[PDB]
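User: Structure with flavin-adenine dinucleotide, C-alpha cells only please.
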Amino acid sequence: ATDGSHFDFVIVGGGTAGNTVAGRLAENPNVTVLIVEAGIGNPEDIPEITTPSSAMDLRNSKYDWAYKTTMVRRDDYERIEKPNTRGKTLGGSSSLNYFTWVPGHKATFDQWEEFGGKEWTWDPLVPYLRKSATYHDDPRLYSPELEKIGGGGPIPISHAELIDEMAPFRENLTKAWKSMGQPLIENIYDGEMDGLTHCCDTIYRGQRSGSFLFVKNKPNITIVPEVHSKRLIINEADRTCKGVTVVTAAGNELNFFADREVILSQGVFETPKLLMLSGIGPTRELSRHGINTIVDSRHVGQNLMDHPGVPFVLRVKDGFGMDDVLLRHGPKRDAVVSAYNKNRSGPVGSGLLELVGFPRIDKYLEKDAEYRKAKAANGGKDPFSPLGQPHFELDFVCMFGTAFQWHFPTPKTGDHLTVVVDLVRPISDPGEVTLNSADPFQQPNINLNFFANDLDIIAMREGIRFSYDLLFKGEGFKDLVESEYPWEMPLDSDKEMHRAVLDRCQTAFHPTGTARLSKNIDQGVVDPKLKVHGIKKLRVADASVIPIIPDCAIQNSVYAVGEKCADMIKAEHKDLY
Ligand SMILES: Cc1cc2nc3c(=O)[nH]c(=O)nc-3n(C[C@H](O)[C@H](O)[C@H](O)COP(=O)(O)OP(=O)(O)OC[C@H]3O[C@@H](n4cnc5c(N)ncnc54)[C@H](O)[C@@H]3O)c2cc1C
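Assistant:
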C-alpha cells in the first residue's frame, strides 16, 4: 500500500475481533477497508496453524508474541513467566488458540449493563454471539436444536470431530461424572451451563477456523502484514483520530488515514499500550515516559482480568490417551499423518479436547472455615458466583499437554490425561498493563495478579479436589488412572496446596478488560458504542473492552464484540450502509 493512503476504515491489528469488524464493514463492496497487522498475512498456508493438533506447538513459535508476564504478585509469592502466548499473525490469537467455542452465562452478561447499558446484556447479545459461526453436525450426533448457535457467519464450528480410539475414555469419564451426582448438559448456549458437555470447536473437517476467514477474497480490503504500529495519529484541536503510523520490515515509517473511523483491535495487551503511546492513558503514567497527555483516561491498561488455571497430568492406562499416536514418533504417528496429508481425516485433525465440565463446587467450599466466614460476611451469597454461574471450566485434554505443563518435561512413556482446572469466576482484584517505555517495539509490562485474594486459592484447591474425586473415585474412570505426574498432588494438607496452587498455576489464556466499555471516562475507556472517551473517530474492538470476564473460554464473546462493533459503525454511517 502507498504511504499516506486513505481508506474509509482502518483496523489496527488483524486479530480475532479486528478481522471480524473489517470483514463485516467490507460487505458493502464500495467501502474501502485497510488492515494493519504485525505478523504474516497468509496463515492459511502454514500447516502448524491450520492443523488443530499442532496448536500447542505454536507456543514460542514465530507466530507467538511470547510476552513475559507476572502471573501472581502477592507479598508471600511472585512469579514471572515467558511465554504468555498471543497470536502474531493474521487472525491474531484465533490462529493459535485451543478451539473451544462457548459463550458464557446469562447472569454474567446481564451484569454488563452496569457498564454498557441494556444493549450489552444477554438477550440483545445472543445474536452477536451466534452471527460469526456456521454450525455443522455432519454425523448428526446432537440435538437439532443446537443448530441455533450458528447464525451463518464465515467461521465454521462443530462439535468436536470425535476420535474413535477415545470413545472408551469418553464413556468412562461420562460414567464417572454422573456417578459424582453432577448433570450432563448439551445446550450450554442459552445462558445456562451446569454440567459436563460435548464441546463445540472452531474446527471443521480437520481445519482450524480462524478470523482470517473474514477478510479473504474481498478486493475492498487492503491487508498490510509485517508492519508494527508506532502510534495513533491524533489531531489535538479536533480531538480526532486521523489514522495510524506503522513501521515496515525495512524500517520505514508509513502513515495510513481513515476517512470515517479507526478501529483499534490489538488485543488486551497491545491495545492499551498503543493508546498510551498515542497520548490516551493515565496522565502520570504517560508523563513518566515522556508522552504528552491528550486525554487523561485513568482506566487505560487497568482492570486486566484473566482466568487462572492449575493443570495437572495423570498417567492413564494404555489406549486411553493420544500420546502414543500424536506425541511420539513412530509408525502410529506416521500413519495418522499420512491420512491427514491426503484428506485431512484422522486424529491429527483433532483439537484433543472433547469433554468439558462446568460444575459448581459448593459442597467442597462449605467444608472450609474461611470460605464459610467469607460467604456469611457477604450476606449469605457465594462470593464467586452469587447468581448461580459455574465455578470451573474443566478441560479434559486427552493427552499430555506441554502448553499446560510449563516447568515439567514431557514424559518419555505412557498415555496421559491433562486436566486444566480453570477457575472461571475468580474474585481477586484485576492486574494491569503498564508501559515499560515509549518504545513501540518493547512489550508492555503485564501483571495478571492471580490469587491476590486468598479465597481464590481456596477455590482452586477445592476445584482440584473435585477433579481428583471425579477421576480417582468416579465410576469407570477410576480403573484407568495409573499414576500422578510428576509427583503427588498434596491434597491432604491445605498449607501445601496453598504453595502448590501458587507455584503450579498459569494463565488459562483468557485476558480481558484493559480498555473496558463503560458509561463515562471515570468508569472505563470506551463508551457503549465502543468509542474511546474523549476522542472522535476511534473505536476499540477486542478482548480489552470486555468489562466482566465470561464464565468460560472467551473467544466466542470476543467475536461477538467485533460483530456488534461493526453493526454500531454501520448504523452511524447511513450514507454507506
Ligand atoms: C494459547 C491460547 C489458547 C486459547 N484457547 C482458547 C480456547 O480454547 N477458547 C476460547 O474461547 N479462547 C481461547 N483463547 C482466547 C482467544 O483466542 C482470545 O481471547 C481472542 O482471540 C482475543 O482476540 P482479540 O481480537 O482481542 O486479540 P488477538 O486475537 O490477539 O488480536 C490482536 C492482533 O493485533 C496484532 N497486533 C498486536 N500488537 C500489534 C502491533 N504493535 N502492531 C501491529 N499489529 C499488532 C496481533 O498480531 C494480532 O493479530 C486462547 C488464547 C491463547 C493465547
